[PDB]
Ligand binder design. Sequence first.
Ligand SMILES: *[C@@H]1O[C@H](CO)[C@@H](O)[C@H](O)[C@H]1NC(C)=O
Ligand SMILES: [Zn+2]
Lengths: 596, 184
Amino acid sequence: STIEELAKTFLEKFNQEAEDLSYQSALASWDYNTNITEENVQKMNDAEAKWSAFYEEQSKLAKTYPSQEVQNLTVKRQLQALQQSGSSALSADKSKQLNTILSTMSTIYSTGKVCNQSNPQECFLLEPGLDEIMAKSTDYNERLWAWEGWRSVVGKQLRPLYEEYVVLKNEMARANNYEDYGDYWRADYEAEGADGYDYSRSQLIDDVERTFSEIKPLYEQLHAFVRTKLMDAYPSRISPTGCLPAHLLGDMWGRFWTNLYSLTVPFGQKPNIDVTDTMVNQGWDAERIFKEAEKFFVSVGLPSMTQGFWENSMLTEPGDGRKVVCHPTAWDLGKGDFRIKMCTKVTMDNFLTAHHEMGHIQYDMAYATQPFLLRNGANEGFHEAVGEIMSLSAATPEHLKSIGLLPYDFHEDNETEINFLLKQALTIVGTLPFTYMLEKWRWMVFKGEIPKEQWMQKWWEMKREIVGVVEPMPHDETYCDPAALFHVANDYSFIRYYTRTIYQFQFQEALCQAAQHEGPLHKCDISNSTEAGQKLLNMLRLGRSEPWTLALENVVGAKNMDVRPLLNYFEPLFTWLKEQNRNSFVGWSTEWTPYA
Amino acid sequence: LCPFDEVFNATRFASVYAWNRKRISNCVADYSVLYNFAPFFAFKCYGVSPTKLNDLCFTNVYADSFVIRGNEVSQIAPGQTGNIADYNYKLPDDFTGCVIAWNSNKLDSKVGGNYNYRYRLFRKSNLKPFERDISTEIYQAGNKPCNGVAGVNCYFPLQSYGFRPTYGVGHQPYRVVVLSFELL
Ligand SMILES: *[C@@H]1O[C@H](CO)[C@@H](O)[C@H](O)[C@H]1NC(C)=O
Ligand SMILES: [Zn+2]
């Protein structure tokens, strides 16, 4: 007559009952993705409905055991991870209204069209057509036209829907003992354990700002660089003591700055590193790339792939007339079944993507022995950060020379180092302020701090202060610009991308120090270093069974986030930028406007 | 002549909880025809050297057969504790015999999935060595009398192996035969 008992039995039954339904659903989904036919379409739903209904039935019975009395942490983690129900606590009609609102928000985004001038035809959509214009076009007028048209078509429709969405989600959050929906999102970082490994939700915000204040000096001197280059592209539309227009950053929204490389090169006379010609001179094929990835992985001290992995995985586009999704994914069907689905080519980007996706397989293989409910990463920010360090380590000149794609006569240079660092920086450092600002705005709008009559004002005011970007045309309260992104129209968390960047560099620095490497961090290589495997293998096996603080400490030696390795990575770029910006101006003043 | 060829080449095997047992006596056992089968995953022997296996004599030979997972083969050993070895089949501490196990993924698996191979996961107390439990009574965990109905806090005692061909290596069906010797 205890609650420690009567809970172990329930979990023992649940694990063995769910490990079959999950496998059936995964197999049906793989069958859908490998070949697309209506018969498979029906089966996908036939499996998903059963899995969802069974999970709901189990969640209904699980809450009868109060979790306060459970003293063992391992059982408590499995029990608490299942007590979460969701929208089932709302009213019957309120449950369907929110689903209708989500569907009518999602349907507009993919069905958005903008008119063309001087002809009723040529109405472009987002994914096929407008992306090309935002990627390659160099005319101010066309970029302004597209930027205004997208937010005049979709934004002006999506605002009342979002006004209802916030109210329904806020009621949902308060129904489940939480404060607001932002507090619901920040429930993924809550850890309980010893007296020093306790992390509360409220501590997350103070860790984002504290870690952001050190990224400011570098970013302010990358921004102040890029602006100057843009003064060549548009001679009379950039202010030397002001911010940057929003429709000139090489993207529809500004999330990435990578498309600006061709306009901002440090030394344009030296060819970049590219070894696709030697991949076809030697005679490689689709299988040899994955074999080389496997050799690299077994070099460091990790297990090799299973016999079935080569038999079930689809490493090439089928030639029997079957249509595929053709997007690189790593699948863990469960019960010792791991697969990789991608359309491999002989390009260098595919060579890196092979390593990136194979990292997920190793991570999943590490914790296959853990119980079913704890087979996930410690937080949402590790499962992608573990795989990216492999791609970082497999793109160094030394590893390529060792494999056989380069000769010994290739000598590294200062200018190529600067070029590679700047290309990395544009992609990595240029996204942090955008993510931080968007997440902070959503957090402050869920709590109701900003009423419905001051949304766009605060949005464009914080755009100038944090990111340094000024709107090209004025916007009143009828518009809704934040809704234009994919992750705002469709409900998705956005803070994982901020933490992943910090984690991937803490891990890289720790592993590099483990392997006895001397020199700049950006040329580290963990090949043939056994002691660099176990240090990693300690964390990967833990899963969610322990608070993420201890899992982090098993690798980095610290207890929370830190930005020192990130600034160690970009030190030569920081010094060079500080040298080139002598007779210029850093910072920005938030009063200049282009429309005036 | 002892008919081991029926035991190691049986067209149908039995489950683990209702495990099958055969008695061998008053015949000449050829122990060298056991190496004419497929390669074996585990061939642990306790107390009798295989090279001297043909050099000794015994009164009775008891052969036990069943089918289990791949992660559970290590539980068939003296002194080891777990789930199969505490609820299904218990081996004596001073065991004198041999254990043979081999993979039968192709023979004992279907694309839809076998569901006639099942095992027991709940029992009140551990099992004395060489004991068979076939009762199918509803398990009792709390204090409410479960009236033979699978309700709240009332569980069915048996669950099925979902053997399928696309599984890994530690989840495919494995066939196990244990030979025990008697000298009295
Ligand atoms: C097992 O039985 C089958 C039944 O036809 C037979 O073909 C096979 O030869 C037997 N195994 C051996 C080792 O003889
Ligand atoms: Zn990834």
